[PDB]
Amino acid sequence: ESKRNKPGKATGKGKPVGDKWLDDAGKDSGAPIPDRIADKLRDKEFKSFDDFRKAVWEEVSKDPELSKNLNPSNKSSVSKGYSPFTPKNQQVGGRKVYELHHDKPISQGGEVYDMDNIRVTTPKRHIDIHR
Amino acid sequence: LKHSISDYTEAEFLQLVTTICNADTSSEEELVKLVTHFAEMTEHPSGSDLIYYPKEGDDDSPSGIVNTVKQWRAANGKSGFKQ
Ligand SMILES: [Zn+2]
Numbered sequence: 001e002s003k004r005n006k007p008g009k010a011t012g013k014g015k016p017v018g019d020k021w022l023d024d025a026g027k028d029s030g031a032p033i034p035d036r037i038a039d040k041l042r043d044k045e046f047k048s049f050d051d052f053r054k055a056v057w058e059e060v061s062k063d064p065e066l067s068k069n070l071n072p073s074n075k076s077s078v079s080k081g082y083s084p085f086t087p088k089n090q091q092v093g094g095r096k097v098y099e100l101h102h103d104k105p106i107s108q109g110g111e112v113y114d115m116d117n118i119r120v121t122t123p124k125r126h127i128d129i130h131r
Numbered sequence: 132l133k134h135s136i137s138d139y140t141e142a143e144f145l146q147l148v149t150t151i152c153n154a155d156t157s158s159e160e161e162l163v164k165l166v167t168h169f170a171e172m173t174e175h176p177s178g179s180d181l182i183y184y185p186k187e188g189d190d191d192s193p194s195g196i197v198n199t200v201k202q203w204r205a206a207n208g209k210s211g212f213k214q
Contacts, residue, residue, distance in 0.1 A: 071191055073182050076154035082162060088170075088178040096163050096179060 003106050004049035012115035014038030019069050022098065022120065026090050030101050030119030030129065036063055038115045049112055053100055054081035086122045095123035136172045136204070141197065141212040144172075149193040151182060173200045174209065 015032035017024070024031035037059045046052040060066050061078035070077075074084040083097035101121045104110030111117045121129065132138050139147070149155070151169060156162040170178040177186075181199060185191040189199055204211055 071183055071185065073152045073154070073191065076152060077159075077162065080154045080156075080159075082154060082159040085166065085179055085183045087184050088180045091179070094163065094167060096166060097159070 004112055006112070007045060007047050008113040009043055009045045010038075010041040010052060010055075010113045010115060011111070012038055012042070012117070014115050017066075021066065022069065022084070022086070025098055025120040026086070026122040026125045029103060030121040030125060033115040033118050033120070034063075034066060036065065041115065046113065049100075052113055053083070056100070057081050057083055060084075090122035090124045092123040092127060097123075099123060099126045101126050101129060133168070135210075136174075136200075137210045137213055139172070139212055140214045141201070144200075144212060145193060145197050148182070148196050152191075152193050152196070173204070175200060175203055 012033070014035040014037060017032065017034045021031055021034065033056070037056060040059050041052070041055055044055065046055065057078040058081045060070075061075065061081075067075055067078065070084055077084050077097075083099070085091075085096050086098055099121050101119045102110050102112070103117050103119055106112055132143075136144065147165065147169065151162065151165050154162055156165065166179050166182065169182070173181070175181055177184075181189075181196055182191065189195065201211065
């Protein structure tokens with residue numbers, strides 16, 4: 001019923017990020033998948049994009065270089081594999097957590113699990129990107 | 132028990148905040164709904180930022196958050212907890 005529910009292995013390199021990583025998710029094309037995270041997820045098989053998404057945030061929870069920019073409560077969220085909450089001004093109603101976005105649309109044949117085709121966005125920016 | 136903060140004793144509200152701060156839910160969806168409810172209950176301008184993006188020098192432990200809510204509502208003409 002959706003292409004994102006077909007199994008696949010994660011691929012791609014990601015990019016270096018700094019402490020402003022999630023701040024960047026509210027801007028432009030969204031933030032890249034951190035190269036550090038991509039290193040750990042590459043070649044793992046996921047049964048769906050939602051399982052890949054859980055894995056991204058679990059890896060964030062385990063990487064002190066990235067988790068240090070989350071407060072205690074958001075650390076709790078990612079420890080469960082949940083997406084962390086964005087600042088209130090980046091939320092849109094019931095969409096309050098960071099969202100994964102595909103730079104090239106899956107509809108146009110963009111890759112579901114290639115992390116070079118994935119970005120981290122805030123709800124506000126994600127809605128705006130798709131227009 | 133779900134409609135406004137005067138429906139919560141301070142202890143019950145602390146339970147809600149503790150649940151959120153611990154992400155003590157079996158799904159992300161549940162947690163987000165709890166956070167939305169929190170923001171609606173407190174009526175605080177910061178919304179969920181009280182929990183996830185504290186002002187400098189604000190205590191973001193569960194009890195710290197409950198105290199920040201309690202003091203703000205007290206200072207801004209709003210009703211307080213039950214009991
Ligand atoms: Zn998107």
